[PDB]
Paper text:
To obtain high resolution M-Sec structural information that might provide insight into the mechanism of membrane protrusion formation, we determined the crystal structure of the N-terminally truncated (residues 1–66) M-Sec at 3.0 Å resolution. Although we could also crystallize the full-length M-Sec, the N-terminal 66 residues are disordered and the corresponding electron density could not be observed. The structure consists entirely of α-helices and intervening loops of variable length, organized into a series of helix-bundle domains. This domain structure is similar to that of subunits of multi-subunit membrane tethering complexes (Exo70, Exo8416, Sec618, and Sec1529 of the exocyst complex, Tip20 and Dsl1 of the Dsl1 complex, Cog4 of the COG complex, and Vps53 and Vps54 of the GARP complex) and cargo-binding domains of myosin V-family proteins. The domain arrangement of M-Sec (domain A: Helix 1–4, domain B: Helix5–9, domain C: Helix9–13, domain D: Helix13–16) is similar to that of Exo70 and adopts a straight rod-like conformation. The calculated electrostatic surface potential of M-Sec revealed a positively charged surface that covers both domains D and E, where conserved lysine and arginine residues are widely distributed and exposed to solvent. To test this possibility, we introduced two sets of mutations that would decrease the overall positive charge in domains D and E: One set is a quadruple mutation K531A/R532A/R533A/K537A, and the other is a double mutation K470A/K474A. These results suggest that the positively charged surface of domains D and E is responsible for the interaction with RalA, which is required for subsequent extension of the plasma membrane.
We found that M-Sec binds phosphoinositides on the plasma membrane via its N-terminal polybasic region. We identified a conserved, positively charged surface in the C-terminal half that is essential for M-Sec interaction with active RalA and promotion of TNT formation by extending out the plasma membrane.
Author numbering: 67 to 199, 205 to 650
């Protein structure tokens, strides 16, 4: 075997790549250091010998790096490792102890070859991350980048991790060399007034795609946990990016909802017949609105959980906004358009929407029920004004045929009432084009109106009965009617159970002839419907013609309808004021 005598030979060996001889190249330098410190040696010779050393050492370098740029060369990469350490520690040798250099020599010795390597790893991490791979130039850049880095670090943990010794940290050096390059190309875009779409794609990337899809979800996963890389953009700048993105998107859905509303507004305006699933659908506004919201919420869920929650609490306010300005536009629709062929039809479509809002917002937001109801307020107002507007026409046709109980001094109830049932049942049809929930919600309204109206008639102090027999006859009448109403309404979709004992129980107060009895049906009747007051008790006893100072007694009951335990009176007598 060797060594190699002439420096010519050695140079020739380096030139043919062979690095057994790398050790000799250092030996020379060491020898020079020797021959110098022997004193006896020309300066004119020192310079010669040193120029030759450092020239050889340049060559050696370019061979080692030449190998390590593309570690797919062979197995004398162990050689290149060995040398990229011999010189690395020789650096430490000639610190300040080998550090005296006789002049004419020119110090060269912190050579820092491992650092050179890092420079190359980094320069290759930047040749590859920068190759030419569209959603955007930016998003295509990020794509190609993330891909390339996942790929390449996968290669390093797969193949370069067993070849490199522990001193170098192959892995840390590679991931960090790529990582920092990524973060550089991002820091570059941060120095810009960027588009909204751009803000979202880079925020997504930093916050979600990078650390999950690349750093964490692969097989790389396990390794880089050790590395502990940071963000791409810096913390403060990321939080700033959030803060502006929110305002972007929140503004997007604000404007978009606004436009949805405007457009449906004109559908009404334009006498568009709504389309019918089973009851009418203008759920156009319903689902189109909730879709705007859901997609915004996804977009801000697709960064952080916290970006998400922030945009939720932030969207509540603009939803409130919309609903409010919706009620207003529907109301204005009511007030003006009316001749329109699909005025009532439209109304029903809109009323229908409330079901979907209730249903979807109860599941989506998970808010307190007073917060829920606080948001949902102007939908009741819309459904209120809705119902009031469709019904209004039948409540009028019904206005005289109730006077006719008073007009005929209750001569024949059942005929008058049958006229009313006819006049109401001739309205059942179109109200079937209305959501089932609201169907029965409206039936309670009609039911209630029939009962209120009846009790308003009996309380009009416009019939006094002289003798028990006709009070019993009147009772039989009332009861007949109460069974007609309760039956028909229940049978047509009302579930207003509370109303059922309204009329029958009054018939009983009319019919009952003995004092105590009347006191007891009064007690019980205040129990069902406790908004029943002395006012009504009077107007009812007015139709009694006997009993004059048992009035005082029967009334001193009602005198304390005061609960204090629970106050849940569904309005019945609240709504019937007679003085």
């Amino acid at each position: 075997d060797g060594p190699l005598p002439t420096v010519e030979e050695l140079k020739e060996a380096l030139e043919h790549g062979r690095l057994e001889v790398a050790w000799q190249v250092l030996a020379l330098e060491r020898q020079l250091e020797a021959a110098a410190a022997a004193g006896g040696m020309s300066n004119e010779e020192l310079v010669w010998r040193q120029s030759k050393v450092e020239a050889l050492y340049v060559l050696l370098c370019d061979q080692v790096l030449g190998v390590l740029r593309r570690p797919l060369e062979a197995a004398p990469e162990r050689l290149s490792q060995a040398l990229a350490v011999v010189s690395q520690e020789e650096l430490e040798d000639r610190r300040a102890s080998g550090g005296p250099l006789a002049a004419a020599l020119e110090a060269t010795r912190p050579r820092r070859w491992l650092q050179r390597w890092r420079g190359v790893v980094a320069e290759v991490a930047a040749e590859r991350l920068d190759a030419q791979p569209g959603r955007s130039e930016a998003e295509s850049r990020f794509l190609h980048m993330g891909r390339t880095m996942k790929e390449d670090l996968e290669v390093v943990v797969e193949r370069l991790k067993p070849l490199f010794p522990d001193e170098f940290n192959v892995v840390r050096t590679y991931a960090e060399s790529y990582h920092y390059h990524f973060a550089s190309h991002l820091c570059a875009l941060a120095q810009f007034e960027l588009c909204e779409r751009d803000t979202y794609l880079l925020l997504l990337w930093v916050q979600n795609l990078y650390p999950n899809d690349i750093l964490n979800s692969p097989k790389l996963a396990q390794e880089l946990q050790g590395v502990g890389l940071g963000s791409l953009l810096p913390p403060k700048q990321i939080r700033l990016l959030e803060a502006m993105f929110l305002s972007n998107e929140v503004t997007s859905v604000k404007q978009l909802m606004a436009r949805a509303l405007e457009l449906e507004s004109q559908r009404w305006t334009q006498d568009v017949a709504p389309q019918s699933l089973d009851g009418h659908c203008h759920s156009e506004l319903a689902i189109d609105i909730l879709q705007i919201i859901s997609q915004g919420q996804t977009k801000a869920e697709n960064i952080t959980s916290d970006v998400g929650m922030q945009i939720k609490q932030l969207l509540l306010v603009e939803l409130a906004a919309l609903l409010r300005s919706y009620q207003r536009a529907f109301d204005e629709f009511l007030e003006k358009s009316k001749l329109l062929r699909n005025y009532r039809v439209n109304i029903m479509a809109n009323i229908n929407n409330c079901l979907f809002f209730w249903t979807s917002v109860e599941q989506k937001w998970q808010i307190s029920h007073d917060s829920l109801n606080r948001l949902l307020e102007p939908l009741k107002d819309l459904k209120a004004h809705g119902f009031d507007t469709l019904l209004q026409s039948l409540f009028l046709d019904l206005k005289p045929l109730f006077k006719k109980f008073t007009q005929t001094r209750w001569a024949n109830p059942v005929e008058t009432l049958e006229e009313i049932i006819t006049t109401v049942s001739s309205s059942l049809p179109e109200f079937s084009e209305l959501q089932d929930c609201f169907r029965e919600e409206l039936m309670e309204t009609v039911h209630l109106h029939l009962v209120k109206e009846y009790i308003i008639r009996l309380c009009k102090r416009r019939l006094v009965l002289k003798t028990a027999e006709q009070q019993q006859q009147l009772a039989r009448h009332i009861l007949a009617n109460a069974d007609a109403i309760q039956g028909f309404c229940t049978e047509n979709g009302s579930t207003a159970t509370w109303l059922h004992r309204a009329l029958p129980m009054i018939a009983e107060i009319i019919r009952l002839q003995d004092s105590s009895a009347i006191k007891i049906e009064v007690a019980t009747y205040a129990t069902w419907y406790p908004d029943f007051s002395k006012g009504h008790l009077n107007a009812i006893l007015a139709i009694k013609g006997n009993l004059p100072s048992s009035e005082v007694r029967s009334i001193r009951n009602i005198l304390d309808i005061n609960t204090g335990v629970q106050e849940p009176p569904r309005p019945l007598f609240s709504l019937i004021k007679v003085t």
